[PDB]
């Protein structure tokens, strides 16, 4: 239950959940995206 | 002009599932051809394996035959 | 024992290979749904308009 | 000696084949853990989104 602690460990809780930037945030996911795309992870 | 339920979830889902087949399969053409060059040799190889038995048991089987024959004569 | 032990090898490229043309086959499948389901959200969307 | 000898021989011949390049497995593995330290990555950059 990761997506559920943290997002509640994460909701002070307003300074938490407004001092990240939403560029940052869109920047860090396109690049997630985009390692994702060739990434293939596997347990070999 | 830009572009039943869960029709759409599950297309979704094995679009998903597409991608996490990153593994580039365009060359499966020349992947059947290998696989059925490999299965050729191994149809050989079985092949040789069992007349190689054969060769070993029936070249002593037929040798004491011989000596048999050839010795009281 | 090298072809028992390459055999997982084998077993893995027969997967990779089902698999790719299972999955081709449902990416066919899933563009022609969404293909039905997009005509039928035009036709509603055009009534709607 | 002899016998002992032709059978080191044919032993040591064995094991040789046995890790001939001990290289493409190590190749294959150095590749997966890249692939799962991108990943790991990935997941990072996940659960800040």
Same mark, same amino acid.
């Given at each position: 239950?990761?997506?559920?602690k943290?997002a509640?460990?994460?909701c002070?809780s ?9 560029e ?6 396109n690049?997630?995206?985009y390692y994702?795309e060739?990434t ?5 | 002009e ?6 759409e979830?599950?297309?979704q889902?094995?679009?998903?599932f597409?991608?996490?087949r990153?593994?580039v399969?365009?060359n499966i053409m020349n992947?059947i051809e290998?696989?059925?060059?490999k299965?050729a040799?191994?149809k050989?190889?079985i092949?040789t394996?069992e007349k190689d038995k054969?060769?070993?048991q029936?070249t002593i089987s037929k ?6 024959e050839t010795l009281?004569? | ?8 090898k084998?077993?893995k490229?027969?997967?990779? =290979? ?6 081709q086959?449902?990416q066919?499948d899933?563009? =022609?749904?969404?293909?039905?389901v997009?005509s039928?959200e035009y036709?509603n969307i =055009?009534? =709607?308009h | 000696?002899?016998?002992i000898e032709?059978?080191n +021989?044919?032993?040591? +011949?064995?094991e040789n084949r ?8 190590n190749?294959? +593995?150095s590749?997966?853990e890249?692939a ?10 996940t659960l800040?989104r």
């Open positions: 239950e990761s997506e559920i943290d509640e460990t994460s002070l307003e300074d938490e959940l407004r001092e990240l930037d939403v940052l945030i869109e920047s860090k996911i690049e997630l995206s994702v060739e293939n992870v596997d347990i070999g | 830009d572009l039943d339920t869960y029709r979830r599950s297309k889902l094995n679009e998903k597409q991608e996490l990153k593994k399969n365009p992947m290998n696989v059925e060059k299965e040799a191994l050989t190889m092949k394996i054969m060769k070993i029936e040798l004491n035959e011989y000596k048999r009281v004569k | 024992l090298l072809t028992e032990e390459i055999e997982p084998l077993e490229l027969r997967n990779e =290979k089902r698999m790719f043309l299972e999955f086959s449902t066919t899933l563009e =022609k749904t969404e293909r039905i997009v039928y036709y =055009k009534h =709607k | 000696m002899g016998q032709n059978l +021989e044919v032993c040591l +011949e064995k046995f890790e001939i390049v001990d290289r493409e497995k190749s294959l +593995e590749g997966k890249t799962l330290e991108f990943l790991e990555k990935e997941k990072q950059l800040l």
